[PDB]
């Protein structure tokens, strides 16, 4: 038997329904989202870290011209200075008076500690939601994982559940994502080969051990002022360090719908944002015939101290005079009130107590025991506790959040105004007919 329903995306908060075939006893269907994740498809643009500036040993040629060629090194900057007179410990360094030339080199590479402190730039595509479902049908429990895409069946051969497309697409990650040490940021890094000095991604490579490193740090070589053999140079600050200084807060703290960002792979787990259509092909072995289940001769429902809140606030008692002892499901036929218990054991005569959670100020709903309705009818009070540590199990909706003796006043005033309209109209017609 195939049953289609719609569950909330909130992790935890089990969803209850009952399945009623024409010739079979109803059974409880119990759909719980125990876990979820929203993993986008990522491709790595580059890696980056704080660069290490390598200044090689200077070249000195004693009154003979020097020039330097192009190099494949990362941000290779070169300059030649003529008319030098270098000195080291020991004395002068060339045999020639004032035509001596010095060639100064400079480039960058990865720091030795980039194996730990480094950032990875990613472009992420549309994310797919995969949920872990606990399905209790009758009294059989199955745990599975399914993709929320509309056509892929769940990971269960004996149940064949299909999760329909998600109500809305959330995708907490922006198009460009930076990951550093498990911290995830929505940063718009520059493209590969488009380095900017003093900003993030000033040095880039395909991997940490890659040899094709490219960088555009603002390095420049100065003419040596004193006559030692140092290489004077000025460079822009490390754009990786500059980004670390003002990275802001990661997406683990700034992400809607209260779901936590995890790496390896990049994903957002336990997001509560939409509604998932779920279709279950319940096997016929789970069903039982209507004659097998105990029957209800009469049943009455009395609600005692209904308190509308997020937890299971409110209790009701079903008094029944059933036939033969047996277990049968119970349900609340309302979208504004959900029971706590699913199946109960009934005897020849007695009363059973159930706990329910509602978002409406009145307990005005139909409770079915063994498939037999009971139409519970009472009032509920606003809660005393302002703040609770669990989410609401029932969505709040109009026409139920407004109670009677508040609907009564509105209907009375509207009916009075309409009564004045009708009496004015009929007196006008009576005057016109004369």
């Amino acid at each position: 038997f195939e049953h289609a329903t719609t569950v909330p995306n909130v992790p935890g908060i089990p969803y209850k329904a009952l399945v009623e075939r024409a010739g079979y006893a109803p059974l409880n269907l119990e759909i719980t989202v125990v876990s979820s994740e929203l993993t986008p498809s990522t491709n790595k643009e580059y890696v980056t870290c704080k660069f290490h500036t390598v200044i090689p040993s200077p070249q000195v040629k004693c009154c003979g011209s020097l020039e330097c060629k192009a190099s494949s090194r990362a941000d290779y900057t070169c300059r030649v200075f003529g008319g030098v007179y270098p000195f080291m410990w020991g004395g002068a360094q060339c045999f020639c008076d004032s035509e001596n030339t010095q060639l100064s080199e400079a480039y960058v590479e990865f720091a030795p500690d980039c194996t730990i402190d480094h950032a990875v730039a990613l472009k992420v595509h549309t994310a797919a939601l995969k949920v872990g479902l606990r399905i209790v049908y009758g009294n059989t429990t199955a745990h599975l994982d399914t993709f929320v895409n509309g056509v892929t069946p769940g990971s269960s051969r004996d149940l064949k559940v299909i999760a329909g497309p998600i109500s809305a697409a959330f995708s907490p990650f922006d198009h460009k994502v930076v990951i550093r040490k498990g911290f995830v940021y929505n940063y718009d890094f520059p493209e590969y080969g488009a380095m900017k000095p003093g900003a993030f991604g000033d040095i880039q490579a395909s991997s940490l051990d890659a040899t094709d490193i490219v960088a555009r740090t603002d390095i420049r070589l100065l003419k040596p002022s004193v006559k030692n053999i140092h290489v004077p140079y000025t460079q822009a600050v490390s754009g990786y360090e500059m980004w670390k200084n003002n990275s802001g807060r990661p997406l683990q703290e700034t992400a809607p719908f209260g779901c936590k960002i995890e790496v390896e792979p990049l994903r957002a787990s336990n997001c509560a944002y939409g509604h998932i259509p779920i279709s279950i092909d319940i096997p016929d072995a789970a069903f039982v015939r209507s004659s097998e289940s105990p029957t209800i001769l009469e049943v009455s429902c009395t609600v005692a101290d209904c308190i509308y809140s997020a937890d299971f606030g409110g209790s009701l008692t079903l008094q029944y005079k059933a036939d033969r002892e047996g277990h049968c499901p119970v349900h609340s036929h309302s979208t504004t009130a959900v029971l706590k218990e699913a199946t109960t054991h009934v005897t020849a005569v007695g009363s059973i107590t159930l706990h329910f959670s509602t978002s409406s100020p009145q307990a005005n709903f139909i409770v079915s025991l063994c498939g037999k309705k009971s139409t519970c009818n009472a009032e509920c009070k606003p809660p005393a506790d302002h703040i609770i540590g669990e989410p609401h199990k029932v969505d709040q909706e109009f026409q139920a959040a407004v109670s009677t003796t508040s609907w009564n006043w509105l209907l009375a005033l509207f009916g009075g105004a309409s009564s004045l309209i009708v009496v004015g109209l009929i007196v006008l017609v009576c005057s016109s007919m004369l």
């Binding site: 944002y273 809140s309 609401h392 003796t405 309209i421």
Partner: protein
């Protein structure tokens, strides 16, 4: 949908107020685990009682909705009274115009 995230370094002994809605709010304090809280409809009134208690209870929960409902019912009774008065006045002058 709107994660109004705040981050602040606290020194000394202070107090911080945070508005919590039905969707909930989490706070992390130092190295502690995140703590999640949710707000209930605990408005200081009475949905089943005299009308002023109902109005203040539903005004603390959803202000603008109840204000426009009150404006709508006031407009409805005003238009109904005015139209009924106009109709009965027209009928009265139509019945008394031959006698005059």
């Amino acid at each position: 949908l709107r994660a109004d995230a705040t981050a602040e370094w606290i020194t000394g002994t202070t107090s911080r107020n945070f508005s919590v809605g039905r969707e909930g709010l989490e706070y992390v304090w130092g190295n502690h685990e995140p703590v999640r809280v949710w707000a209930q409809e605990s408005a200081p009134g009475d949905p089943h009682g005299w009308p002023h208690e109902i109005i203040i209870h539903y005004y603390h929960r959803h202000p603008v909705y109840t204000v426009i409902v009150l404006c709508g019912v006031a407009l409805a009774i005003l238009v109904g009274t005015a139209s009924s008065a106009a109709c009965i006045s027209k009928a009265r002058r139509d019945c008394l115009t031959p006698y005059a």
